[PDB]
Nucleic acid binder design. Structure first.
Ligand SMILES: Nc1nc2c(ncn2[C@@H]2O[C@H](COP(=O)(O)OP(=O)(O)OP(=O)(O)O)[C@@H](O)[C@H]2O)c(=O)[nH]1
Lengths: 104, 120, 133, 179
RNA sequence: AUACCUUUCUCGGCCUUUUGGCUCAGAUCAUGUGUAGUAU
RNA sequence: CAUACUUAUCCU
């Protein structure tokens, strides 16, 4: 109904997680998207380049033994399964496979 | 517990879809199947299994086999619940009077077409 | 009959259209070991020094002594394994250059110098691996 | 069927905790056995009603050899079949299979199930005639079953061919891997 | 003694709330004598 | 007077 609000000698209890560690910061160097390096370039050129590369270079274009047998061709007509995402908790494919695997 | 719930949602839905999407077995798959079975059973000179006769020579041996089987779950049993105690009571009754157990069983097979809830 | 391979929903292609690209990304392209921001590493191949060192001669003195064939001798130094070649070259370096505090660092760290054994992997086997002029 | 606050009516399956569930399973499976075999290979495997022949045996060798399906068993919902094929029979089968699942690239062998549990020489090889006889008899027996009742799944199946270039016949039956 | 306004009484009526949040409905659910004290 | 309840009291 209402959370605790968290407003702010000093106590001398020292936590283990509060001991010195990672005591200097990494900064972005030349080569890791540093700010002075990135004013120099046209990021729209590189984005439209990479998007065009992706979007084109994904498109790829510039009587027998079985005579008494009562049923014939019963696999033909079966649906081949597809890489798809269903946003359903219980009706997606991971879940149907999971329940198939673990419940016998 | 979570997986029995998840399985039972899936299984409730499978049972629903059967009643909506109808018998999956096609009317002329079922008939080819029924007919294959008929021609098999007739090739085998098979005779149906009849309803357990009244003066059936084996009726009480089969019931005693049944009851032995049902009792066997209770030969290590250390603490029983009301359905396990009720089961042991009815096993004892059917050992004590096999003839009225047999008559109840045959009345069940003859008449009973609606049954209680199964726990899963 | 439509089985319990029933479809409950349309595809992302019926949902979004032909001109929306629909991606299902269920596994990562790369492992956790490939940084997302690649560290800008000193590419530790064979690490030399950052300026021509002090010698007992100049630059132009060697420039002189090169331009006339009668004061230049070309010599390769060979021997068995370990028989002293690298160390003799090193003694030459030690007598004709300026590297004394280098020697102090060498006998403080507990190793004797190997000048021509420069590649720090040829170094850590006490072996000359590739000839050096 | 009730679990706690969950409940539904069973209309479709079989309740396996019934005491006579095994009898329904075994009779229904017998019907699926007759679907797999036909009423002639079944009546030859079974033997006459008067003189039935024992588990894996036949009355004659003319009766035994008439048909590819040589040995047959079903352990409740699990089937083991041994066929022996002529190379003419095997060839006709592999033909019909590929003409039904045409793949020019030779992507046939990729998703094949043969167990890594045995040593690498002794397992079933990657010959095209052998991988394809495997998949072709799987496919041809899987076509025998109305998919409204059951299918076979390749991932819960196992075929092993003993051919020229394969010396061992493999199966696993109950917990036993047999080579 | 009647018409007006106006004032009084009697019927008809009303919202949050008191909701201990979660999980494996959290789990299980039921196999005594004997005395005495009491309720009956 | 007969059903029930019980209590680190008492046995089986
Ligand atoms: N006793 C003695 N040992 C020496 C002398 N000179 C060098 N050494 C030792 O011999 C070892 C091998 O000599 P290196 O300097 O590696 O010479 P190398 O024969 O070229 O060896 P590689 O690099 O393997 O070809 C050195 O690490 C020294 O410890 C010397 O005059 N006397």
């Amino acid at each position: 109904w209402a959370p605790a609000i968290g407003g702010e000698k000093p106590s001398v209890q020292q936590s283990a997680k509060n001991l010195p560690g990672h005591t200097k910061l990494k900064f972005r160097q030349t080569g890791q998207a540093a700010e002075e390096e990135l004013r120099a370039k046209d990021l729209r050129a590189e984005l439209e380049a990479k998007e065009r590369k992706h979007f084109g270079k994904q498109s790829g274009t510039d009587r027998r033994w079985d005579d008494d047998v009562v049923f014939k061709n019963q696999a033909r007509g079966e649906p081949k399964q597809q890489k798809r995402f269903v946003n359903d908790t219980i009706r997606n494919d991971f879940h149907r496979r999971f329940l198939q695997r673990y419940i016998r | 517990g979570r997986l029995t719930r998840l399985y039972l949602k899936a299984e409730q839905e499978r049972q629903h879809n059967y009643l909506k999407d109808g018998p999956y077995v096609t009317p002329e798959e079922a008939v080819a199947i029924y007919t294959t079975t008929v021609h098999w059973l007739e090739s085998r000179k098979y005779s149906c299994i009849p309803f357990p006769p009244l003066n059936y020579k084996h009726d009480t041996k089969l019931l005693i086999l049944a009851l032995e089987r049902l009792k066997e779950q209770y030969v290590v049993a250390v603490r029983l619940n009301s359905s396990q105690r009720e089961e042991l009571g009815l096993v004892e009754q059917a050992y004590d009077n096999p003839h009225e157990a047999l008559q109840r069983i045959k009345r069940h097979l003859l008449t009973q077409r609606s049954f209680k809830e199964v726990a899963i | 009959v439509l089985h319990e391979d029933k479809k409950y929903y349309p595809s992302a292609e019926e949902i979004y259209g032909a001109e929306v690209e629909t991606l299902v990304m269920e596994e990562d392209a790369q492992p956790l070991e490939v940084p997302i921001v690649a560290p800008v590493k000193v590419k530790k191949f064979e690490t030399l020094e950052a300026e021509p060192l002090r010698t007992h001669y100049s630059n132009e003195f060697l420039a002189t002594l090169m331009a006339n064939p009668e004061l230049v001798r070309n010599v390769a130094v060979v021997g068995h394994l370990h028989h002293g070649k690298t160390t003799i070259m090193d003694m030459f370096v030690e007598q004709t250059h300026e590297l004394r505090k280098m020697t102090a660092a060498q006998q403080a760290a507990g190793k004797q110098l190997r000048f021509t054994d420069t590649r720090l992997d040829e170094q850590a086997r006490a072996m000359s691996i590739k000839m050096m002029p | 069927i009730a679990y706690k606050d969950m409940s539904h009516t069973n209309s479709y399956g079989l309740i396996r905790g019934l005491q006579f569930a095994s009898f329904i399973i075994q009779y229904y499976g017998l019907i699926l056995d007759l679907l797999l075999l036909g009423l002639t290979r079944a009546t030859e495997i079974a033997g006459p009603p008067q003189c039935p022949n024992e588990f894996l045996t036949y009355r004659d060798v003319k009766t035994e050899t008439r048909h590819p399906i040589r040995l047959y068993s079903r352990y409740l919902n699990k089937v083991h079949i041994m066929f022996r094929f002529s190379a003419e029979e095997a060839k006709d089968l592999i033909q019909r299979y590929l003409t039904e699942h045409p793949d020019p690239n030779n992507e046939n062998i990729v998703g094949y199930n043969n167990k890594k549990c045995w040593p690498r020489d002794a397992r079933m090889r990657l010959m095209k005639h052998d991988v394809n006889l495997g998949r072709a008899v799987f496919w041809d027996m899987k076509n025998r079953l109305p998919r409204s009742l059951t299918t076979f799944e390749w991932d819960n199946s196992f075929v092993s061919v003993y051919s020229r270039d394969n010396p061992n016949l493999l199966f696993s039956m109950l917990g036993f891997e047999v080579r």
